[PDB]
Design a protein around this nucleic acid. Structure first.
Ligand SMILES: [Mg+2]
Ligand SMILES: [Mg+2]
Ligand SMILES: [Mg+2]
Ligand SMILES: [Mg+2]
Ligand SMILES: [Mg+2]
Ligand SMILES: [Mg+2]
Ligand SMILES: [Mg+2]
Ligand SMILES: [Mg+2]
Ligand SMILES: [Mg+2]
Ligand SMILES: [Mg+2]
Ligand SMILES: [Mg+2]
Ligand SMILES: [Mg+2]
Ligand SMILES: [Mg+2]
Ligand SMILES: [Mg+2]
Ligand SMILES: [Mg+2]
Ligand SMILES: [Mg+2]
Ligand SMILES: [Mg+2]
Ligand SMILES: [Mg+2]
Ligand SMILES: [Mg+2]
Ligand SMILES: [Mg+2]
Ligand SMILES: [Mg+2]
Ligand SMILES: [Mg+2]
Ligand SMILES: [Mg+2]
Ligand SMILES: [Mg+2]
Ligand SMILES: [Mg+2]
Ligand SMILES: [Mg+2]
Ligand SMILES: [Mg+2]
Ligand SMILES: [Mg+2]
Ligand SMILES: [Mg+2]
Ligand SMILES: [Mg+2]
Ligand SMILES: [Mg+2]
Ligand SMILES: [Mg+2]
Ligand SMILES: [Mg+2]
Ligand SMILES: [Mg+2]
Ligand SMILES: [Mg+2]
Ligand SMILES: [Mg+2]
Ligand SMILES: [Mg+2]
Ligand SMILES: [Mg+2]
Ligand SMILES: [Mg+2]
Ligand SMILES: [Mg+2]
Ligand SMILES: [Mg+2]
Ligand SMILES: [Mg+2]
Ligand SMILES: [Mg+2]
Ligand SMILES: [Mg+2]
Ligand SMILES: [Mg+2]
Ligand SMILES: [Mg+2]
Ligand SMILES: [Mg+2]
Ligand SMILES: [Mg+2]
Ligand SMILES: [Mg+2]
Ligand SMILES: [Mg+2]
Ligand SMILES: [Mg+2]
Ligand SMILES: [Mg+2]
Ligand SMILES: [Mg+2]
Ligand SMILES: [Mg+2]
Ligand SMILES: [Mg+2]
Ligand SMILES: [Mg+2]
Ligand SMILES: [Mg+2]
Ligand SMILES: [Mg+2]
Ligand SMILES: [Mg+2]
Ligand SMILES: [Mg+2]
Ligand SMILES: [Mg+2]
Ligand SMILES: [Mg+2]
Ligand SMILES: [Mg+2]
Ligand SMILES: [Mg+2]
Ligand SMILES: [Mg+2]
Ligand SMILES: [Mg+2]
Ligand SMILES: [Mg+2]
Ligand SMILES: [Mg+2]
Ligand SMILES: [Mg+2]
Ligand SMILES: [Mg+2]
Ligand SMILES: [Mg+2]
Ligand SMILES: [Mg+2]
Ligand SMILES: [Mg+2]
Ligand SMILES: [Mg+2]
Ligand SMILES: [Mg+2]
Ligand SMILES: [Mg+2]
Ligand SMILES: [Mg+2]
Ligand SMILES: [Mg+2]
Ligand SMILES: [Mg+2]
Ligand SMILES: [Mg+2]
Ligand SMILES: [Mg+2]
Ligand SMILES: [Mg+2]
Ligand SMILES: [Mg+2]
Ligand SMILES: [Mg+2]
Ligand SMILES: [Mg+2]
Ligand SMILES: [Mg+2]
Ligand SMILES: [Mg+2]
Ligand SMILES: [Mg+2]
Ligand SMILES: [Mg+2]
Ligand SMILES: [Mg+2]
Ligand SMILES: [Mg+2]
Ligand SMILES: [Mg+2]
Ligand SMILES: [Mg+2]
Ligand SMILES: [Mg+2]
Ligand SMILES: [Mg+2]
Ligand SMILES: [Mg+2]
Ligand SMILES: [Mg+2]
Ligand SMILES: [Mg+2]
Ligand SMILES: [Mg+2]
Ligand SMILES: [Mg+2]
Ligand SMILES: [Mg+2]
Ligand SMILES: [Mg+2]
Ligand SMILES: [Mg+2]
Lengths: 48, 77
RNA sequence: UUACUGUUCCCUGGGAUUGGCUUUGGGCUUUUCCUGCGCAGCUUAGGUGGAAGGCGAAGAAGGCCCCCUUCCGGGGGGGCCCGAGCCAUCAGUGAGAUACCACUCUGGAAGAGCUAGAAUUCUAACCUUGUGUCAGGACCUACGGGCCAAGGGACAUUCU
RNA sequence: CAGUGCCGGAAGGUCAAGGAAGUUGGUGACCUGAUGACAGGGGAGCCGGCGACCGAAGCCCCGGUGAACGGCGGCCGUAACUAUAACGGUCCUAAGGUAGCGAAAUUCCUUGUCGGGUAAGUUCCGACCCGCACGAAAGGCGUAACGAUCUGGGCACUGUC
RNA sequence: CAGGGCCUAAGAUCAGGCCGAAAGGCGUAGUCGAUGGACAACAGGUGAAUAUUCCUGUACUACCCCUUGUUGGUCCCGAGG
RNA sequence: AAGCGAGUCUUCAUAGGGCAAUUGUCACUGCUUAUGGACCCGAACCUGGGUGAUCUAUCCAUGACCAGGAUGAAGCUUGGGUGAAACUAAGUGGAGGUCCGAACCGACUGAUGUUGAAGAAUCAGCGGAUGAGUUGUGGUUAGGGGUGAAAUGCCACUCG
RNA sequence: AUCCCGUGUGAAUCAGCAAGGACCACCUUGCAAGGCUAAAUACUCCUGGGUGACCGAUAGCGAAGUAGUACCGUGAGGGA
RNA sequence: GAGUUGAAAAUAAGCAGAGAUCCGGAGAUUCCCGAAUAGGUCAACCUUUCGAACUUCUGCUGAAUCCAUGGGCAGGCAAGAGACAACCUGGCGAACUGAAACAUCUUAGUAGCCAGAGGAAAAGAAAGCAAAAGCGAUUCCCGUAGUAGCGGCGAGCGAA
């Protein structure tokens, strides 16, 4: 139907460009999260 | 086959219908992708054909839940 | 076959697979500022309310000039010079003072915001190669497997 | 280069799914009406219709392209005698059949007319052009060699007669 | 002598592999597949019905057997043919 | 139709009009009707699933074959041409989808045959015969197909 | 409406959720997204009994004898 | 309980009242092909180092790669595989026909094919009916009923 921007809320475990310092809270697109951050150990998807 | 292992999706049997009401056999297919998925508990990727719904579900429940319900060992994959 | 109804190849848009940074830009804004020739006239009467108080040395009236809008009638406004005034029922006018202040409308501006569209990159999805390189008792210049690299790249492919 | 096809073009019109400002309806916590066996308005929610504007290709639009599909006309009048028409007028088209050939595997009327071959020729050869209805890569016109090809004549030869 | 116990061509099947409503389709190593490559026998005789097959002569391949001579050979692989 | 009910619908009006104010049933036998193959025999066809390339149509692999005779291209060597080259007899050479002609492949005319000797032949003649040739063995392509030097031909005496 | 599937979005837990033929209110009924279960019912390549207003060699099974045989077809198949 | 060595005589020999031939239960053997399964093949054969191939099972072993996966070796009377008339369940799924043509509709989710399992299968323990009164998993028959409905409101289809 209408494209709905997917929003994954995450914590950064290392510092990455444009994102920020280690141990940081953010919200991201699903593609960015699962295809880039997550395989490289860089981020962690959070649902407490 | 055009089948997702994980959700067991099948191609669906459907009539294409014209403005004239004239019916025709047709196939709607599962949306299948050749994807690599990260497996954290294996520290490694797995090549799979997946439905997109399956990809979703893997985001939601984590890969291992899904593969355990579908009974498919990530090792033999 | 330019009969009818369709199907298919194929082309093109939405959705999905599908991401990052940057630009440029169409339509809405968030403070806030620009802007109005019924006639009776101090005169290009903004509607509605608080309404005898405001604007000044964190420096006005008044003349010297820069800019922009323009119905060249005049309006906002930067610099400087200037130094104690522009003021209200003061009478007109359906509606009041450019003393001031709130949500705002006619269109303009600006930094900020939503959504496209568009163009440009980037690399990790995805695609394509490899007599590149490992590999089991031994091979895989036998298809293929893992790793690495190379070229593309969010296009394309596949699905709806 | 009008029609059709094909290619290229991007300014305007048209243009689906889908978005979408916004209106609109049903219900209804409730609020009032009413000498009839009831009725009228209505918040939130839920549900439904409509929907300005955004919305690609294609089409309409502009240009090219015949060894792409195909197409290549009428009517008049005129010259030392009959005649004919080089030359003019007009009409209509995208444009009006050039070179070469022509009674042809094409010619209706038709055994056209003329010449030749025969004692005698509806066939044959050459030429005229009045091409019903030739014509240029669905090629036009030539052409040595070739053909169990089609067609006319001649010598030899024969019971074909 | 002719095929098989040898080798491969066209082609066929095809472990794993890729794809596909099912059946299956494609395809790698492998394995099949002669109409080809490789490989050693002729004359005479007999003869109701067989003969390069049985008889008599000379042959020829492949193994095994002994003597002698050496110590590594065998396959996998590199090559010539 | 709510509904009324020996009445009711239409109506301002019973004013008129419409329809109503009553009726057995269960079998068996027959005749007909309907539904199934439906009185019987008779198509061309249509679709589904298999079976076929021992014939023929293309090809693939690997083999084999084509008596005999002619003709005489290039080339080459010689020898006159000029400094180079051209031009010309000569010899040699042995090309050709060359020629004549058996095998072999065809099938042009005629006669015979027509309940044939034969579901395409015999007889006399005829075309090709070193090639775009002939053929053997083993394979390939399969019917919404295949193959086609194209006839709608061929795909087991069957092929719009 | 109820039911079940492709593509995309995507809830609520009993103060709920679903159904009552678009939809809303009220009331009634029910508890989806985990499984498994006998009988009553269908059938005859057959087995054992039984009956027949069934046939009696052109009938009854194609087949009362080599019967899926002989024969025909490359084959599927036909078939006395 | 007396004769016997199939149809099936004849011949030849046996076996037999310490019980033959015969009938029933349980075992044994079961060449070659066939799922075919040591490898091959043109079924009923060949070659073999004599082997239930492959997939599951148990153990040992342990690639690229640490855990693993794959592979290798061994054990094992070893689970499966194939066959099967109709019925059944799932999957694919027509066309002639009817409609006096035909396209929606009908034929019909029928035939056919494929896969699967059983003596039956499937369904099945209310997120169900119903209607203000009540029922109490599924299946099957009678009836409701050719009713309500569906329908180029046609042919027809047809509940609860
Ligand atoms: Mg999304
Ligand atoms: Mg698309
Ligand atoms: Mg996208
Ligand atoms: Mg790269
Ligand atoms: Mg490799
Ligand atoms: Mg590699
Ligand atoms: Mg790049
Ligand atoms: Mg894309
Ligand atoms: Mg034109
Ligand atoms: Mg044109
Ligand atoms: Mg043009
Ligand atoms: Mg165009
Ligand atoms: Mg457009
Ligand atoms: Mg719209
Ligand atoms: Mg709206
Ligand atoms: Mg309303
Ligand atoms: Mg009310
Ligand atoms: Mg209301
Ligand atoms: Mg638009
Ligand atoms: Mg031309
Ligand atoms: Mg004439
Ligand atoms: Mg004539
Ligand atoms: Mg004459
Ligand atoms: Mg004559
Ligand atoms: Mg002539
Ligand atoms: Mg003509
Ligand atoms: Mg013409
Ligand atoms: Mg012509
Ligand atoms: Mg001509
Ligand atoms: Mg032409
Ligand atoms: Mg020609
Ligand atoms: Mg000539
Ligand atoms: Mg010829
Ligand atoms: Mg081969
Ligand atoms: Mg195969
Ligand atoms: Mg396999
Ligand atoms: Mg192979
Ligand atoms: Mg062999
Ligand atoms: Mg041989
Ligand atoms: Mg030998
Ligand atoms: Mg030999
Ligand atoms: Mg003999
Ligand atoms: Mg001899
Ligand atoms: Mg001797
Ligand atoms: Mg020897
Ligand atoms: Mg070698
Ligand atoms: Mg009356
Ligand atoms: Mg019939
Ligand atoms: Mg037809
Ligand atoms: Mg068929
Ligand atoms: Mg076949
Ligand atoms: Mg064959
Ligand atoms: Mg053949
Ligand atoms: Mg032949
Ligand atoms: Mg050959
Ligand atoms: Mg010979
Ligand atoms: Mg010769
Ligand atoms: Mg010669
Ligand atoms: Mg010749
Ligand atoms: Mg010749
Ligand atoms: Mg011929
Ligand atoms: Mg002859
Ligand atoms: Mg001859
Ligand atoms: Mg000849
Ligand atoms: Mg030659
Ligand atoms: Mg041919
Ligand atoms: Mg024809
Ligand atoms: Mg036949
Ligand atoms: Mg034939
Ligand atoms: Mg024919
Ligand atoms: Mg329900
Ligand atoms: Mg119901
Ligand atoms: Mg479904
Ligand atoms: Mg969903
Ligand atoms: Mg919840
Ligand atoms: Mg619902
Ligand atoms: Mg309920
Ligand atoms: Mg529950
Ligand atoms: Mg449900
Ligand atoms: Mg349950
Ligand atoms: Mg069950
Ligand atoms: Mg008889
Ligand atoms: Mg009989
Ligand atoms: Mg009798
Ligand atoms: Mg036995
Ligand atoms: Mg034996
Ligand atoms: Mg075997
Ligand atoms: Mg076998
Ligand atoms: Mg170990
Ligand atoms: Mg390891
Ligand atoms: Mg293992
Ligand atoms: Mg084992
Ligand atoms: Mg089985
Ligand atoms: Mg089976
Ligand atoms: Mg069984
Ligand atoms: Mg029909
Ligand atoms: Mg029909
Ligand atoms: Mg009909
Ligand atoms: Mg009819
Ligand atoms: Mg039972
Ligand atoms: Mg059951
Ligand atoms: Mg119970
Ligand atoms: Mg329960």
């Amino acid at each position: 139907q209408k494209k709905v921007k997917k929003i994954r809320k995450i914590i950064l475990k290392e510092d990455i460009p444009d994102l920020g310092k280690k141990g940081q809270l953010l919200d991201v697109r699903a593609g960015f999260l699962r295809n880039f951050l997550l395989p490289l150990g860089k981020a962690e998807v959070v649902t407490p | 086959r055009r089948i997702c292992p994980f959700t067991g999706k099948k191609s669906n049997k459907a009539n294409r219908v014209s403005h004239s009401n004239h019916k025709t056999k047709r196939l709607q297919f599962v949306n299948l992708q050749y994807k690599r998925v990260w497996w954290e508990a294996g520290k490694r990727f797995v090549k799979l054909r997946l439905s997109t719904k399956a990809l979703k579900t893997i985001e939601k429940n984590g890969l291992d839940a899904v593969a355990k319900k579908a009974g498919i060992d990530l090792r033999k994959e």
